C-alpha cells in the first residue's frame, strides 16, 4: 500500500532534478520506474531502478538521464540533463512492490 | 548452510534476469514510441 | 538459522515483480506494438 | 546452451510446439517463444516462469498455452484454434544467468 | 442636164461606196458585240468561282469557331486534370515529408 | 430633158443621210469598245478580287493547320497526364 | 445535341472492341475519347480520337490498343487487343462538340 | 523555335504580376501557358490564356490570379493578388506554335 | 538543320511563282489586244482590197469609155 | 517527313518552272506573230491608202475629161 | 447566264400570249421586261414585272395588256388582249440578273 | 471485454473518412452551382446577342423594303419614258 | 470498456447521421445535374436558332447586293433612255423654232 | 417626306458645282438625281448618283461633269467642269424615298 | 390601303396588351405562389433547426444519464 | 393626315412591347430562382422531418431504456 | 379709121392683160422665196 | 394711113411678151411652187 | 362674165374639159384652167392665150392639152393620160379687161 | 439684141439707187424686171416695169423700192429704200425685147 508522490517540477529555458517520495520500503526497494505523459498522447517510458542498481534507460533518453535511489531518504531520483524541448511532459513515478504497482499524482516538467 | 547457499544463486539469478528482463522493455518502448510517433501521418 | 526464512522473503517478493514485468510486456512488446503498426 | 524447438509443419486446428533445452531441471528462469511473421518484426507470444506463472500477448490469449515439463526438461507450446494470421516462425527464447538464447527456429503454417 | 449628169453619176458612187461602208460597221459591231459576249462569260464564270470561295470561306470560319470552342474545353479539363488532381496528389503524397 | 433632172433625188438620200447615219454606226463602236474595256477593268479587279480571297483562304487553311496542332499535342499532354495518374493510384495498390 | 451509344462489351478469357455510336457530326468530328471507370476508381481516358485521325494513347494502353475512326457510319472504335484481367472495367465514351462535353450511357467490359 | 523570357519576380511580405515575353506570333496567339514549380517538386500549371482571351486557372489560384493577354506588346501577363506564402515557386511561362511545346527559364517568386 | 537550305529553295520557288502569275497575265492580256488589233487591221486591209478592185475596174472602164468618146469627137468633127 | 516533303515542294518549284518555259511559248509563238503581222498589215493599210487617194484623185480627173468630152460632143452634133 | 427563250408567236384576227422561258432565277427573279421591235422602228417597252410583282405598263398598252409572272415553272407571261393590227411587231423578252442583262432570240407577232 | 474495444474501430472509419469527403460533396454542389449560373449568364448574353440579329434582320428587311420601293417607282418612271417615245415617234408617222 | 461503449454508441449515429446526409447530397447534385441539363438544352436550341438567322442574314445581303445592281443597270438604261432619246428628240422637234 | 434645296448656282464666262442638301436619310440613300430644264423645253436629266457611289451620266454632260455624294453633310453635289454655253439650264435635285418622288426648287445657272 | 393597315397594326398593340395580361397571370399565379411557400418554408428551417439543437441536447444530455446509470448498475451488482 | 395620330398609337404599342418583353424576362427568371430555391427548402424541410421522426423515436426508446436501469439501480439496491 | 380704132382696144387691152398678169408674179415669187425659206430646216 | 402699120408692131411685139410671161408663169406658178413644196 | 364649166366626174384614161364663156368671141386674153388638189393650195395647169399660144406646167407637159373654139366660144382642155395624182378640182379661169374671174369649179378623179 | 449691164453697186451700214443701161429701145421699153441672186441661192424678183408704166413689186420688199423709167436716158431704175440688212444679193436687171430675155453681168449691194 506505498503511497508514491512525484516532485522536481517547474519550467526551464536546462537540468532539471526529479524526486519520487515513497511511503515505505527502505533498503527494499524493488522496481521504481519513471513514467511521463506526452499531453494529448500516451504514458512513455524513462528509466527503471530496482533493489540492487541495475538502471536501464529508454532508448530517446539514453546517456542524458540517471536515474539513483536514495534508501535512507526513501526516493528514486530521475535526474535531467542534455535537455531537450521535447521532454515537456506530465512525469510520473511507478512502483512495484509485493507485485502490485502503485503510481502517483504526477507532476510537470516544461522545457521551452 | 548448504540449502540457505543454494538460496544465493536463486536471488543472484532473479536479480540477474530481471536485469535483462526490463533491459528488453528499454528497446521494448522505444518502438512503441517510435510506432505512436506514425500516428502524427494521421493527426 | 533464522536468517534462512527472510531469503524466501527474497525470493517470494522478486519472483512477483517478474509477473508483473512479464505481464507489462505482453501489453508492450506484443500486443500495443503489433497493434499500433497496423493501425 | 543449446536449445532445439520441434513441432512446425503446415498444416490445414491445434498443434504442439516444443522446446528441447541442454540442462537446468526447474532452474532457467523466464522461457518465451517468439514468432516473426514473415516480412514482420518478430514478436512475443507466451512466456513461462521458474513458479509456473504464464503469460500471452493479447493476440492469442486464450488460445495459445505456455507450458513446462521439468522431467523431460522442455518447455512446450500448446497452440490451438490456429488462425490463417497465425502462419510464422516460432522460435524459443530464453534467459539463462542473464544472457538470452535463442534457437534455431521452427516454422508453422496454416491456411 | 447639162451638169446634172454628172451629179447622178457622182452621188452613185458616193451612194455605192457608203453602200459597201455600211456593211463593213456592220460587220464591225458584230465582231465587237462577239467580244463583248466573250468577256461576260469570263466575268460570269469568275463571279460564281468568287462565290464559290465565299462560302468556303464561310466554312473555315465554320471550322475556326468550332476548333476554338474545342480549345476552351481541353483547358479547361487541363484545369482540374493538371491543378487539382495532380497538385492535391503531390499534396496527398506530402506523407513522405 | 426628164430622167435626169428628177433622178438625182433618189441618189442624194444615200449621201445626206447615210452621212449623218453612219456616225451613229462609229459612236456605237466607241460604245462597245467602251463595254469592253470597261468590263476589261472589271476583270483585272476581280483577279485581284481573287488574289487577296485566293490569300485569306490560305490563311484560314494554315489557322485550321495550327489550331490541330495544338489538339494533337495537347491531347498527348493529357495522354500522360492520366499515365501520371495511373502511375500515382497504382501506388496505392502497395497500401490499399 | 450529339447522342452517343457505346457497344460491344462483355466478357473474355485475347480481344475485343468497342463502338460509340454517335447521333449526329457526321465528319464533323472533333476529340472523341474513351474513359474507363474501373470497379471502385475514378474514370479515366484511354485513347484520343481527332477529325485529322491523330490517335493518341495512355501509357497503360499504348502499343495495345487502337482508337479508330469510321466518319462514314458515325461512330468511332476502340480496337481492344492482347488483354489483362487488369483491363475489368465500365468503359464508356466522349465528345466534344460545340465546345459541349457529351458523354454516353456506357458498357460494362469484364475480363478475366 | 520561340524563346519565352519572364519578367515581374520578387520577394515581398503582398501582390505581384508575372509576365511573359515572346518571339513571335503578334496575335496569331494560340495555347500559352504558365506553370510553377515548387521546390522538390514536379512542374504544374496554373493558368491558361488562349489567343481568344479565353482563360482558365487550377482550384489552387481562382479568384486570385488573373491572366491577360497583350497582343501589340508580344506578352502575356499573370497577375497575382492577394498573393499567399503557399504559392512561392518558379514560374515558367509556357506556349504552343507549331505544335511542339517552348519553355522558358522561370522566375523564382517568394512570398513569405 | 538543312531547313535553311531548303526553305531558301523555296523562297525562290515562290519568288519564280510570282513572276509565273505577272509575265502569264501580262502576255495574256497583250496578246488579247494584239490579236483583235489584228483581226481589226486584216479587216480593214480586206475591204480596202475590195474597194481597190472595184475602183481599178472603174478606172479601166471610164478609160476606154473616153478613148471611145474621143473617137466619136474625131468623127464628128470630120462631119 | 518534312525532308521528303519540302523536297517534293522543290519539286513544285522545278513543274512551275516548266510552266515559265510554257509562258516563253506563248511569248514565242503567239505574240511574236501577233505583233509581226500588226506591223506588216499597218503598213500595207498606209500604202493602200495612199494609193486611193491617188485613186480618187484619178477617177475626179477622168470624170471631168469626160464632162468636157461630152460637152464638145454635143457641141459638134449641134452642128 | 440566265438563257431566255420566247415562245407563242403568230397570227390573229382578238387574243394572243407570250411566254418568255428563263433558264435560271428560279424565284430569284428580279426585273423581266418586254421588249417589241416595230418593223422598220426600234425596239420599245411593253410591260415590266418584278420580284414582288409589281407590274407596270406604257401607255400605249396599259389597260390592255397583262404582264403575269408564273415563279413555279421559270417562265414570265405577257397576256395580250383586245389588240390592234398596229401590235404587229417582233416581241422579245428582257431579263436582269446579276447586273447583267439578257436579251431573248424574240419571235414574230403579226397581227392584222 | 473484448468486441468493444474492437468495434470502435469499425465506427471511427466513418466519422473520419465521411466528415472529409461529405466537403468534397460540397465543392461539388458549389461547382454544379457554378456551372448553372455560368451558363445562366450566357443565356442572358444570347437573348442580347438575339436581341441584336432581331434588329439586324428587321433593318436588312426595311433595306428591301426600300429597295423594291425604288424599283417600283424606276420602273413606272421608264413605262411614261417609253410613252413619251411612242407618243413623239407617233408625230414622225404625220410627215413619214 | 468502461468508457469506450459510449464510443461505440455515439459514432453509430455520427455515422448514421451522416449516413443519411449522404443521400440527401447525392439527390441534391443528381437534381442540380438535372438543372444544368434544362440549361443545355435551352442554349443549344438557341446556339442553333442564332446560327439560322445567321444565313437568314446572310440570304439578306445576297438580295441586297443584287438588288443593288439592278438598279444599277435601271440607273444606266435612263442615261440612254432620258438622257440620249429624250434630249435629241426634242433638239430634232426644234424645227418648229 | 423630304425637302430638297440646291445650293451653287450663278452665271459666268468658266466652272461651276451644284450642290443639293436634303432633309433626312443619312446615308441611307437611294437614287438621288439632278435635272435640268432649258427654258420652254421639258425637264430632263443628267446625272444619277446611287447610296452606294454608282454613277451615271447622260451622253451630253459625261466626261464634264462628275457627281458625288456626302452622306456626313447630308448633301450630295453634281461637279460641272469645262462649262458650255449650252449647258444653261434650271437645275433641280431629286431623290426617291419610300418610293415617292420628291423635287427641288432649282437654282438657274446661266453660262455664255 | 395604309388606313386598314395601321389599324390592324393597332390591333397588334390590343393583342400585345393581350400577352400584358399573360405576364400579369405569370405574376398572379407562379411569382406569388413560390415567394409564399418560400417564406413559410424557411420559417419552418428556422423552427426545424431549433429544434434539432434541443434534440441534440436532450440526446447528450440523457445519454450522459445512461452512462452514470451503467456505471452505478456496474459498482452495486459488484457488491 | 391621319398617320399622326395613328402612328402614335404604333408608337405606343411598341413602347408597351418592350414593357412585355422586359417584364416577361425579369419574371420568368425570378420564377425560376423562386422555384429551384423552393424545391431545394422542401427537400432540405424533409429531410429534417425524417430526421426529426428517427430522432423523437431515439428519445423515447433511450429514456425508456433508463428507467429500466434505474429500476435494476434499485433492486440491486434492494439485493 | 374704123378698123385703126379696133386696134386702139386690142392695145389697151394687150398692155392691160399684162399689168393683172405680172401682178400675180408679185404674189407667186413671194410663196415661191417662202416655200425656198423652208430650205433653212434642211440647210 | 400709114400709121396703121405701127398698130400691129405695137400688137406683134406686145402679144409675143405675153406669151414669155406665160412660159415664166409655167415654172414659177406652178412648177416650182409644187415642186420645192414637196421637198 | 360668167364661166361655167363642165365635164368633170370619178373616172376609171382621158377626159374633156370645157368652160363655157359669156361674149367675145375671140376678144379675151388669157384663159386658163387651176387645179387644186385637196389640202393643197391651187395652182395652174394650163395657158391658152389670143391668138394661139399655148404652155403647161412641166408636172403636166405632153399629157394636158389647151384649145380654143371661137365659134362655140369655149376653152377646152383634153386632159390625158390621168395619173392618180390627177385628182382635183379643176376651175376656169380668165383675164378680161384686166379683172380675173373664176368659175364655179369641176372636180374630176382618178383611181 | 439689146444688151443690158447693170449698176449701182456698193455698199451701205441706207438707201441706194440702181440702173440697168439699155443698148437700144428708146420709149419702146416693155418688160424690164430686176432680179437679185441670193448669195448661195437661187435668183429673185424685185419689181417690174413696162412700156406704160404699170410697175408691181414683190411682197417682200413692197412700199419700199420704186422702179421708175427713163425712155430719154435709156434706162430703168430700182431705187432701194427703207433698206433691211437681208437686201445683200447679187442683183441683175432683165430684159424681154421682141420676146427675147436679155440679162447683163449683174452688180451686188451688200447691205450690212
Known amino acids: ?112 | 548452510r548448504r540449502d540457505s547457499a543454494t538460496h544465493e544463486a536463486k536471488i543472484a539469478e532473479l536479480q540477474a534476469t530481471i536485469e535483462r528482463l526490463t533491459s528488453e522493455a528499454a528497446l521494448a518502448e522505444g518502438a512503441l514510441e517510435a510506432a505512436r510517433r506514425d500516428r502524427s501521418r494521421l493527426q
Open chain 1, 1 to 112: 500500500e506505498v503511497q508514491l508522490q512525484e516532485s522536481g517540477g517547474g519550467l526551464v529555458y536546462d537540468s532539471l532534478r526529479l524526486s519520487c517520495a515513497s511511503s515505505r520500503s527502505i533498503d527494499g526497494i524493488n522496481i521504481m520506474r519513471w513514467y511521463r505523459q506526452a499531453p494529448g498522447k500516451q504514458r512513455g517510458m524513462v528509466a527503471v531502478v530496482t533493489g540492487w542498481g541495475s538502471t536501464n534507460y529508454v532508448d530517446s533518453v539514453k546517456g542524458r538521464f540517471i536515474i539513483s535511489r536514495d534508501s535512507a531518504k526513501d526516493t528514486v531520483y530521475l535526474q535531467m540533463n542534455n535537455l531537450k524541448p521535447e521532454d515537456t511532459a506530465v512525469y510520473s513515478c511507478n512502483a512495484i512492490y509485493r507485485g502490485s504497482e502503485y503510481w502517483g499524482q504526477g507532476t510537470q516538467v516544461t522545457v521551452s
